[PDB]
Symmetry: C3
Subunit: 330 residues, 3 copies
Amino acid sequence: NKKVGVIFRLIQLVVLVYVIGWVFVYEKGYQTSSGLISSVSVKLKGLAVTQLQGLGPQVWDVADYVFPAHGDSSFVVMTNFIMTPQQAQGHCAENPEGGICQDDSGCTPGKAERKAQGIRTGNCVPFNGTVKTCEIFGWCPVEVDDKIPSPALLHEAENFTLFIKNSISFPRFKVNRRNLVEEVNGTYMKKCLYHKILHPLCPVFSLGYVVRESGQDFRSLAEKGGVVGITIDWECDLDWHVRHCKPIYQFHGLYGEKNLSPGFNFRFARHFVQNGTNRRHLFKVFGIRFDILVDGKAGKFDIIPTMTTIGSGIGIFGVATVLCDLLLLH
Amino acid sequence: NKKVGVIFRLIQLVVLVYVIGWVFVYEKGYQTSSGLISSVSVKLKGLAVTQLQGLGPQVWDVADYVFPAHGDSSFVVMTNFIMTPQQAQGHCAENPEGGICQDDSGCTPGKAERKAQGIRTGNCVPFNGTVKTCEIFGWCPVEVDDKIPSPALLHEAENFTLFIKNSISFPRFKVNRRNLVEEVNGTYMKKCLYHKILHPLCPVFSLGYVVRESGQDFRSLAEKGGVVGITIDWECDLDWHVRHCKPIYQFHGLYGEKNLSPGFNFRFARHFVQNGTNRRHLFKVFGIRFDILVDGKAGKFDIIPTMTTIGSGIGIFGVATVLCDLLLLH
Amino acid sequence: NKKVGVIFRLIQLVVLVYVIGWVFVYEKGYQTSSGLISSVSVKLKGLAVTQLQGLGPQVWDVADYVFPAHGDSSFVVMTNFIMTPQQAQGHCAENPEGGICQDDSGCTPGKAERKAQGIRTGNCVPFNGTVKTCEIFGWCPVEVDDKIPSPALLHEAENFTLFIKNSISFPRFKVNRRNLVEEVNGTYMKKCLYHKILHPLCPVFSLGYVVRESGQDFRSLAEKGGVVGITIDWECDLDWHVRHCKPIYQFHGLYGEKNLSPGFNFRFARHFVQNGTNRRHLFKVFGIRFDILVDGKAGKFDIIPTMTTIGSGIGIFGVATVLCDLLLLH
Ligand SMILES: Nc1ncnc2c1ncn2[C@@H]1O[C@H](COP(=O)(O)OP(=O)(O)OP(=O)(O)O)[C@@H](O)[C@H]1O
Ligand SMILES: Nc1ncnc2c1ncn2[C@@H]1O[C@H](COP(=O)(O)OP(=O)(O)OP(=O)(O)O)[C@@H](O)[C@H]1O
Ligand SMILES: Nc1ncnc2c1ncn2[C@@H]1O[C@H](COP(=O)(O)OP(=O)(O)OP(=O)(O)O)[C@@H](O)[C@H]1O
Ligand SMILES: *[C@@H]1O[C@H](CO)[C@@H](O)[C@H](O)[C@H]1NC(C)=O
Ligand SMILES: *[C@@H]1O[C@H](CO)[C@@H](O)[C@H](O)[C@H]1NC(C)=O
Ligand SMILES: *[C@@H]1O[C@H](CO)[C@@H](O)[C@H](O)[C@H]1NC(C)=O
Ligand SMILES: *[C@@H]1O[C@H](CO)[C@@H](O)[C@H](O)[C@H]1NC(C)=O
Ligand SMILES: *[C@@H]1O[C@H](CO)[C@@H](O)[C@H](O)[C@H]1NC(C)=O
Ligand SMILES: *[C@@H]1O[C@H](CO)[C@@H](O)[C@H](O)[C@H]1NC(C)=O
Ligand SMILES: *[C@@H]1O[C@H](CO)[C@@H](O)[C@H](O)[C@H]1NC(C)=O
Ligand SMILES: *[C@@H]1O[C@H](CO)[C@@H](O)[C@H](O)[C@H]1NC(C)=O
Ligand SMILES: *[C@@H]1O[C@H](CO)[C@@H](O)[C@H](O)[C@H]1NC(C)=O
Ligand SMILES: [Ca+2]
Ligand SMILES: [Mg+2]
Ligand SMILES: [Mg+2]
Ligand SMILES: [Mg+2]
């Protein structure tokens, strides 16, 4: 019965290497894990000029296309918009999307149950020469978004510069880290663009590069909106120096079927007073949605997790020996 | 004895079924699990007309009551508000809740330590015919919010239509899903409203229906504000087809004591220039805020989790056999 | 030997006391834990007057320095700003930090690849008496933010009052709780300031106190920006009365190296129409970023977790007895 003893010793050494190698080195059992508190700050530096027929050139800056101007992890960068200027409340025709009337008797006074555009007065007024729509009480210039410009108005926003400022701190270990690692210098930040292989630590991200890394064409998203997911990973080992701690950036493309509700869009208004009359400008903005999520874990050596892992390894070794003895007994 | 062997085989088959079933089949240990990256897009439709005393009708559209116009998981829908128009900086009387003075000597120049309304000039001026308040420097049309209208101004927002666009993707499995499931055909959305049993996949949610599902009456919340929590679950099995992956919507009502701090409210201003003077309109908006949280888990068959579960089951079987033998030995 | 036997009995009773005490009493294994749904509401009460050279006093109320006026867990409180008023689109000189030209031939028509400030017409115009900059198309009053005032403009915002309204609910146990505990009352809320020892339940947080508890001086964070992280813990036991459930507030300071990108800052603009011409006021706001994160769990007695913990304890006791017997055999 020497071969059975050799098999027993082989199982013994295998489970020993498993409990000493996988639990300690691979899983970092002797270390302890703690969460972090993260705050994301984003700033854009880009300018795009859009010229519309019958209107002067429009200058767009960081305050314009960044609607969360205060700064948030979730922000929208405007790429295409539909402008309905000089809106004023009054009795006027509605959009043909709500309904088409051939006579005043067909119109019913009240409010539409679904997709209401205003309060119908019960009269049928011609929206244009061909068709007629119900008269409603509201903003007289209706947003007609049936025509979307195929070339993106803010097409210059493809190669803009996006700077992400992320500060993370572990309360258990009392260590504060920032995306600006020691390998990040001022002269380096002056001229650098983020790359997956060349410049990973450069905190300046190109919007077109971010969109292309996610797997989406920038033009199709700029046409009618899009969603891009950015994730920052702070997995690091505090047994080494804090210089080794560096963030990892991953880009994920969030998209759906193109036939049903493609892209991301919303409507906002700028209220102003002109000539003593309250007016507003309505914009249907097709912009790319950027969501930043920060998840990180830090491991530092501690005696209690080490002792617990040693006890678990001893228990696993004992269970393995007992199972081998039972298999030998048959 | 025979009973000893019967009990032994019974425990054997019980632990075998346990390690091959609940542990393996029910808990789905043969599949790996990972998180998702989610982005929430919300769009509101519906119009409400509010006619104030001594003021013309005010038309409110999606851009108006939705203050997060860009689109976020946490958004506030206006249901009631208190409007103080034409606010200009100057020297004027303060609110009575801040302080009541009977003479100029009682007033003290400076700023209030708590609940400051303006820089006190140091003179006692009559707020109205009966009482007098300290003169302060700031917006002279001071907000008087002691009277809240019992009927909600934007009470038509009960049966509005809320569209939620959620795109989730699992980076581990590289599978992208959207709330617009294959059952959603685009024409179904034209005439569907979300229901717990009838229309679970309709992406259009009625605000009143959501408030009722949360366990609250819409009128009481619309009067003085409210908080409603919406959760979306994406638990699915990747071994089946992707069509089986469907989101589950749950509504939670977040409330508290009605006596102390009832509802939810905030204050914002719209700055404009009229007649060469900087003026603003102050609104105390009593509206219901909706917080959308997305959590999902996907499982797909993998060999390593299966092997680990098989090893754990074999270990548990061995431990159970040892314990049964020790118990039968007595 | 009897001594070996009593040693084995001592070891087994020790491990039994361990598995019965640590798992049940200390770790609360007999009860199950679930997550919560949290919504954070913040309200600021404070007024700061900033007087600029050549401009009248400016009143900044809650609606002014709270840019997320609708209310969110992540909000920025304005403490210092650089104001550039009366911005209009035109052909004027650019900022000298972008480029300096000595002749018209040096200028290149087009847009800058990095940090673009506008569309260069191609002519070199004098920015001031000494130096000349490239003429660009855009907002003529180019922002000159080289000089930052050392005293914070909104330095009065140090001892302002911040009220946090957090409502949490556990869907598994259907228990709803709010940060306003039964001990907190209206008279207490009228006059109280949060303290770690004196007033832990007071929901009114002083901004200066919050910044000092995080470990940062308020002056530098007000001058050049800062980030402060607030965490709310709702760890509670449902075996006791709901009165014992009270939130715990912790403040974490998120900072980085001062040499490279110190503090937090953003840029926003207010659009208005004056004299029939579209104009805007651009502000470079240096403010403290406040992030509120809520994480908590609740535990209530259940039979299935208790039975599972009892089974695990019996298994651990059996494994320990088997290992002790194997050691005694050696
Ligand atoms: N989106 C961006 N693209 C390119 N560079 C950026 C961007 N954001 C910041 N930077 C650079 O990082 C440096 C430090 O950033 P910081 O947060 O101090 O901005 P800032 O200096 O206040 O902005 P500005 O350069 O407009 O004054 C700046 O010199 C700036 O040039
Ligand atoms: N809140 C809502 N209530 C009801 N239907 C909605 C809502 N939001 C969107 N829809 C419908 O869903 C469809 C697809 O949504 P999508 O994001 O394409 O809107 P859209 O067509 O860009 O906006 P609009 O309908 O204003 O032109 C639209 O035809 C629209 O009618
Ligand atoms: N930032 C704050 N600082 C000090 N006290 C506050 C603050 N926010 C709210 N409170 C106090 O809490 C009480 C209840 O809060 P609530 O949300 O009802 O405010 P409110 O009464 O709507 O606002 P206001 O007091 O301005 O009318 C109020 O009486 C108010 O005095
Ligand atoms: C009038 O408006 C309708 C709206 O759908 C459009 O189909 C039609 O072509 C328009 N006619 C003219 C002459 O513009
Ligand atoms: C791409 O980047 C360059 C900068 O080198 C810029 O000039 C160009 O306009 C960008 N492309 C688009 C489509 O904006
Ligand atoms: C700063 O770090 C960057 C990293 O690539 C490096 O290229 C640059 O030379 C460094 N500058 C100094 C002054 O060390
Ligand atoms: C004057 O204002 C005070 C404020 O509380 C109010 O109680 C009182 O009724 C007012 N008097 C008149 C005549 O409006
Ligand atoms: C309920 O919905 C209907 C649409 O069918 C609408 O007409 C009605 O105004 C809604 N109720 C309220 C109180 O808004
Ligand atoms: C699309 O799916 C919906 C799901 O309810 C169904 O009612 C509708 O008939 C379907 N349309 C088509 C054209 O299949
Ligand atoms: C002109 O502007 C430049 C910008 O850097 C500055 O250095 C210089 O001192 C200015 N000269 C005068 C006279 O203001
Ligand atoms: C500190 O708080 C007091 C209120 O007691 C206030 O008067 C003072 O202005 C505050 N300090 C600063 C620097 O704002
Ligand atoms: C309000 O709460 C405080 C905090 O302990 C307490 O001292 C005070 O007695 C309470 N007042 C009332 C009326 O309950
Ligand atoms: Ca205006
Ligand atoms: Mg449309
Ligand atoms: Mg009040
Ligand atoms: Mg600068």
